[PDB]
């Protein structure tokens, strides 16, 4: 199902002058590393064709 | 000698690289017969087959091994005394892992091990035999069968050295009846004897032995236990010191008992547990409490020292829910009476858990506490819950050319889309009767608990038709008690009803002097209602109350220009009291009081009359048949009488019942009761009659006696009741036993 | 209202010999169906032991004791014939009447649950057979037999085109003169049995006596032989990619019920409802489906042949049984 597309893109807060935000940790997603794979319904759900 | 190459064949179970890495000397090294034997031994360590040969005839060495089916699975040829799952997991633990290597030596080993295990469970005479079969691609299957006889009956327990009491008292309290032996039960019954002696107060009691013996025939086990009783010890006043938190007044009030009384083990345990709980109530979640008796030969006097170290005050950093699915977190966290970021009121957390079980939508609730990793001072509390899935759903339609439509519908779900609603819809079309109702409550319209609810209904017999709507506000007004107010609308019109005198006097009471003949009556009114109500939930028990009194009261009045002016009162009560200080056996008094009466010169409308009879109102009579009987004008010449039930305007019921989880079966549920109920009709006046009942006074108090049974059922908790009417009058229909749900 | 209580221990004996005790409570108004209007109230107990013989089979056996109590049976030939048989003088002219029995019984049965899937079965067979006999004693000396059968056979190894056969058989008279007329009797029509005929509408219609003639209200019958051949297919249109759980079926049903003891002599003037030859027929289309809230059924039928006053019910819907 499609519903996990159209989730709002992340947009990092801007730190105001003269102070800074906490250190951040845990549930941070590493960037896509230019992954060229398919997205969504285009993904081949089938298992590998052969070992 | 130096070898330049090695020759292998097979390698089914182990690869060439494994052989190269395992062997102590590799290709190109200096080796001799001793080193070759060492390389053979190393290969054995990998798990390969026992038979091997090596030949040296040049620059290369040839090695061969005898491969054979070794990979095994386990099956057993029937098992009665021991279940299949325990057998297979036990077999795995003994060494036969599904997919492990197997050998005849392993067959004997597992046979012996199974014999040992069987002996462990009390069938000392069992025997085990196993065989194997081959499978394609070098595999085996294992089948083993068992020979066993009777398992050991225990006999005399021969408790020796006692001088208080005697054998039968101790063995009566033991789950090991003079039956099957079990070592763990021996431990448990060694603690049940110790606790008995400590409760009686032989605080120097000691057990210096215990052994079991098998008759040479091994059919049974003698138990024996030596006792040293010591002297008759006597308690002395408890003395407290340590890192208290300044609560010494409450601790001393809780810990102090009069001196000279006898020592008791559970007494000291309950006192120490109450001390740590009281510290747990103020926020010391993990106190370190210790108790030691001063034992003195002087006067045999015993004085306990109790040391309490309170530790840190713990703050609940974070409340989480797990299993909260099909329910939004808001509903559980609003029922949770304990706040995040507060000091941990321990029994405030348990009051939360209790209120969640009160809600009743959850199959189980468990409360855990754990410290946050690496910080000394903050506690994390999480609730684990299961869903009842209340949503019983039924629907059906038929549609036919000669039967244009018929239907029945029924939908009651709590937390319909989760959240916290209660939605209840029902409906019907038979050919004789149309019915429908819808109701919606959103009981936390404000987070303080100010409930809102509304109901719509439509009722239409092919004759009586009625429809209406009401709403309520349910604002809680203390910890226990609750209060409600409400408003609504109903309409009725009746038509062609039997010419009953009670109704005709009512109809007359409007000034609508009826036609006293020919069934040609028709009468319609719109009615607008104010509700008050009052409630008292103070039973402190999840399912079957034991020592609390509940009260419930309801009003209606119809001042706001309704086509009839009247009022109603219901009061409903259930007072429970335990047997002396033991809430496991209990007696209760359940009572009611109904009254309803005319306003504005009118008489109360008949259709609002109270009804008596059946499990709902009074045990031992047919449902709603205990109201004063009707009376009719003559038709297919006097004021003819008939034994048919019409509700009364005022009512009283009192029944006293003893609730008894009687341990005739293993306590892992019945009652008996006296019962009375009456119904009477204020504006029914004897002056118009001669030879008719005493409707004008409740004099006709009628009763039953009998017993009831209670049980747990999927939908709801069920009650079963039996009675015979020892005090009943003419035309009082009854039968002896009846069923009800809740 | 209807209520029951049942609990079973799988091992009274270690051979899988289970013991299940059933107690029940019933409150039945015959006016709540097409059945000729009378009230039936009953309660009782059976103690039942259930155990296999091979594979998936079960045997069962069990004594039972039951209470029955009757009231206000509308004054008609069948009911008064039950009273007569029992020897209680009938109040033919006034329906102000009542009658109770206590009854004492044994039952036996067989199950051959060679089924495949609880939902969307394609290759399997079921036979459910139970016999009730009253043991010498009771107030009613009836005997009863109930047989139910279901068989699935795939035409396509792809298990899309399965034929669903069902049959349903029963019979019961009793020892001596204590018939089984009025308190245990089979019914046909509804969504179960032959679809397209109204609930319990198939069978004899009783005869009035004049009261304070032939009527078209059913009493049920004591002899019965329902059947249904139901042919099942892929649905032509729905989104198979999702809908592969939804069942669509074409069906043809047979219904017959009769009374062995409808005496065509005494009732010479009224229809010969003891003839079984009056088989009712219906065939049509049905859908059966599992949805997160509940299972659904839809089925229309043309009851293409039926007898006079047999009340048709051309389309049915139900959820959640």
């Amino acid at each position: 199902d499609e519903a996990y597309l159209e989730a709002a893109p992340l947009a990092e807060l801007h730190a105001p002058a003269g102070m800074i935000l906490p250190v951040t940790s845990g549930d941070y997603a590493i960037p896509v590393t230019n992954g060229s794979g398919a997205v969504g319904k285009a993904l081949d759900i089938r298992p590998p064709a052969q070992p | 000698f130096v070898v330049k190459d090695i020759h292998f064949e097979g390698l089914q179970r182990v690869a060439v690289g494994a052989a190269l890495l395992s062997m102590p000397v590799r290709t190109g090294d200096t080796v001799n017969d001793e080193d070759i034997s060492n390389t053979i031994r190393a290969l054995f360590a990998t798990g390969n087959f026992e038979d091997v040969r090596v030949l040296r005839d040049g620059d290369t060495l040839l090695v061969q091994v005898k491969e054979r089916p070794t990979i095994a699975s386990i099956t057993f040829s029937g098992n009665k005394s021991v279940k299949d799952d325990m057998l297979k997991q036990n077999l795995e633990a003994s060494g036969v892992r599904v997919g492990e290597s197997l050998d005849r030596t392993t067959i004997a080993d597992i046979e012996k091990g199974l014999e040992d295990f069987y002996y462990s469970v009390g069938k000392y005479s069992a025997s085990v035999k196993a065989v194997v079969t081959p499978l394609p691609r070098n595999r085996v299957d294992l089948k083993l069968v068992f020979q066993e006889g009777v398992s050991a009956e225990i006999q005399q327990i021969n408790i020796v050295g006692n001088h208080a009491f005697t054998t039968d008292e101790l063995i009566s309290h033991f789950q090991l009846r003079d039956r099957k032996y079990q070592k763990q039960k021996l431990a448990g019954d060694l603690e049940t004897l110790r606790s008995y002696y400590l409760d009686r107060g032989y605080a120097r009691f000691n057990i210096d032995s215990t052994q079991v013996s098998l008759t040479p025939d091994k059919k049974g086990i003698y138990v024996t236990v030596n006792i040293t009783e010591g002297d008759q010890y006597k308690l002395s006043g408890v003395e407290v010191s340590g890192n208290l938190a300044g609560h010494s007044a409450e601790i001393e009030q809780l810990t102090k008992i009069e001196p000279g009384e006898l020592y008791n083990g559970t007494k000291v345990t309950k006192m120490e547990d109450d001390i740590k709980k009281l510290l747990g109530r103020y926020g010391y979640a993990y106190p370190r409490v210790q108790s030691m008796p001063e034992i003195n030969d002087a006067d045999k006097t015993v004085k306990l020292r109790v040391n309490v170290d309170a530790g840190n005050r713990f703050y609940v950093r974070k409340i989480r829910f797990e299993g909260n699915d099909t329910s939004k977190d808001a509903v559980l966290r609003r029922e949770m009476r304990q706040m995040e970021g507060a000091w941990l009121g321990s029994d405030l957390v348990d009051q939360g858990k209790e209120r969640l079980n009160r809600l009743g939508f959850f199959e189980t609730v468990d409360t855990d506490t754990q410290r946050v990793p690496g910080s000394p001072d903050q506690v994390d509390v999480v609730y684990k819950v299961k869903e009842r899935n209340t949503g019983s759903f039924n629907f059906g339609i038929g549609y036919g050319t000669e039967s244009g439509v018929s239907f029945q519908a029924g939908v009651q779900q709590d937390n319909w889309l989760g959240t916290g609603y209660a939605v209840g819809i029902n409906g019907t079309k038979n050919d004789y009767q149309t019915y429908a109702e819808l109701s919606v409550t959103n009981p936390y319209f404000t987070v303080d608990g100010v409930s809102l609810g509304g109901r719509l209904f439509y009722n239409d017999f092919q004759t009586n038709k009625s429809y209406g709507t009401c709403v309520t506000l349910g604002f809680p007004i203390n910890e226990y008690n609750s209060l409600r107010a409400g408003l609504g609308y109903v309409h009725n019109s009746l038509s062609n009803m039997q010419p009953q005198v009670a109704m005709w006097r009512y109809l007359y009471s409007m000034g609508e002097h009826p036609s006293t003949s020919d069934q040609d009556n028709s009468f319609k009114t719109d009615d607008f209602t104010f509700n008050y109500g009052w409630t008292y939930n103070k039973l402190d028990r999840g399912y079957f109350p034991t020592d609390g009194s509940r009260v419930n009261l309801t009003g209606k009045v119809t001042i706001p220009g309704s086509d009839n002016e009247y009022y109603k009162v219901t009061l409903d009560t259930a007072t429970y009291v335990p047997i002396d200080d033991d809430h496991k056996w209990v007696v209760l008094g359940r009572t009611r009081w109904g009254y309803g009466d005319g306003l504005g010169g009118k008489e109360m409308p008949f259709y609002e009359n109270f009804y008596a009879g059946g499990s709902s109102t009074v045990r031992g009579f047919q449902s709603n048949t205990i109201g004063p009987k009707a009376v009719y004008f003559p038709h297919q010449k006097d004021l003819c009488k008939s034994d048919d039930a019409v509700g009364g305007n005022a009512m009283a019921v009192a029944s006293l019942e003893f609730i008894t989880p009687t341990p005739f079966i293993s306590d892992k549920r019945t009652s008996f009761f006296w019962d009375m109920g009456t119904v009477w009709d204020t504006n029914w006046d004897s002056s118009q009659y001669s030879g008719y009942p005493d409707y004008s006074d409740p004099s006709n108090i009628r009763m039953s006696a009998g017993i009831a049974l209670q049980w747990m059922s999927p939908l709801g908790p069920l009650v079963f009741s039996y009675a015979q009417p020892f005090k009943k009058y003419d035309g009082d229909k009854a039968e002896q036993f009846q069923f009800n749900i809740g | 209202t209807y209520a029951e209580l049942s609990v079973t221990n799988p091992y009274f004996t270690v051979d899988g010999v289970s013991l299940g005790g059933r107690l029940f409570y019933n409150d039945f108004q015959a006016d709540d169906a097409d059945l000729s209007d009378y009230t039936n109230k009953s309660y009782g107990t059976d103690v039942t032991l259930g155990f296999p013989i091979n594979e998936y089979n079960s045997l069962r056996a069990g004594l039972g004791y039951v209470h029955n109590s009757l009231s206000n049976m509308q004054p008609q030939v069948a009911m008064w014939r039950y009273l007569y048989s029992m020897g209680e003088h009938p109040s033919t002219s006034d329906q102000d009447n009542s009658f109770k029995t206590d009854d004492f019984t044994f039952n036996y049965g067989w199950t051959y649950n060679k089924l495949d899937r609880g939902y969307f079965p394609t290759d399997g067979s079921r036979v459910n057979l139970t016999g009730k006999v009253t043991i010498p004693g009771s107030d009613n000396e009836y005997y009863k037999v109930t047989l139910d059968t279901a068989t699935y056979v795939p035409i396509d190894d792809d298990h899309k085109w399965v034929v669903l056969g069902r049959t349903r058989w029963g019979y019961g008279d009793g020892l001596g003169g204590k018939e089984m007329p009025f308190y245990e009797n089979f019914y046909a029509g509804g969504s179960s049995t032959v679809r397209g005929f109204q609930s319990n509408t198939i069978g004899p219609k009783a005869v009035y006596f004049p009261h304070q003639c032939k009527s078209d209200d059913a009493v049920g019958g004591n002899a019965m032989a329902v059947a249904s051949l139901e042919f099942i297919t892929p649905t032509p249109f729905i989104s198979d990619k999702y809908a592969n759980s939804v069942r669509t079926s074409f069906f043809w049903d047979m219904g017959t019920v009769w009374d062995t003891n409808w005496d065509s002599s005494q009732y010479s003037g009224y229809p010969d409802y003891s003839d079984p030859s009056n088989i009712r027929m219906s065939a049509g289309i049905a859908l059966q489906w599992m949805s997160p809230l509940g299972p659904l059924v839809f089925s229309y039928a043309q009851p293409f042949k039926k007898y006079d006053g047999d009340k048709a019910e051309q389309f049915q819907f139900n959820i959640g049984k």
Partner: protein, 88 residues
Amino acid sequence: RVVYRPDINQGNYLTANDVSKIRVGMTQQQVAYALGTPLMSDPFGTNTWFYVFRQQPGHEGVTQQTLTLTFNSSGVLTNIDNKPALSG
């Protein structure tokens, strides 16, 4: 204004006999020992603890004792700001 609501309690249980334990120049770890851990700390780039004691039972007046203390970098107690009542 009589419909019952559960008592609100929030933050660390400060008391008149513990707060005198706070004195300038204590090391932050020993302040954590003296008053227990702070239920609130400034996320926004400086090392300060906001002890708060707050109760609001039923509908009676809210009562509060906020206690702000600042640590310089490396964790030495520089000051103590005590407000013994709500600003009202």
